[PDB]
Design a protein around this ligand. Sequence first.
Ligand code: APC
Ligand code: DX4
Ligand code: CA
Ligand code: CA
Ligand code: CA
Length: 159
Amino acid sequence: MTVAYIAIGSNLASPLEQVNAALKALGDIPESHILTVSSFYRTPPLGPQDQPDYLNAAVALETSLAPEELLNHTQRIELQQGRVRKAERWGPRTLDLDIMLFGNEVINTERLTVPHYDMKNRGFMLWPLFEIAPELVFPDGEMLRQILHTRAFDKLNKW
Ligand SMILES: Nc1ncnc2c1ncn2[C@@H]1O[C@H](COP(=O)(O)CP(=O)(O)OP(=O)(O)O)[C@@H](O)[C@H]1O
Ligand SMILES: Nc1nc2[nH]cnc2c(=S)[nH]1
Ligand SMILES: [Ca+2]
Ligand SMILES: [Ca+2]
Ligand SMILES: [Ca+2]
């Protein structure tokens, strides 16, 4: 099995309820087990700012699924939690499940790019990741602890 790390976000339809429901759904993904759940953080919106604050979190999920198979399940869960596509880039959503990392794999398919392209620039991804995996090393050898020591990210507040 491989340890995948999934970023969770919600800013619509009661984010705490959406995230708790998503965690239960993540538990039902086949060939997979949740290892660790982060704290929940209240985060200002990235992109357009005319939307509610997000609940952001992270989960470690060990799995024997193929990377795109895991994506099939995360997309399914988003859709089943009423996620509807709107035109607005980075606009509000009931649930976002991004695959941040899939072990040490570097994946570039039509549907999937891992590591997540912007995660090293987002405190709302890196802080919950550090909470659950403080010893993490990226596929390029960069240490999570070193990024968080060196780069300025705003303080992240718990939900
Ligand atoms: N690592 C990854 N995790 C989840 N989806 C990914 C992905 N890499 C590529 N994708 C693709 O990204 C597509 C669009 O997803 P969106 O949720 O609309 C982007 P977003 O999460 O709002 O922005 P962001 O990636 O800047 O955080 C999905 O349909 C999926 O095919
Ligand atoms: N804080 C935050 N802002 C966003 N804008 C679009 N998606 C997001 C998520 S998931 N979190
Ligand atoms: Ca399972
Ligand atoms: Ca996202
Ligand atoms: Ca997404």
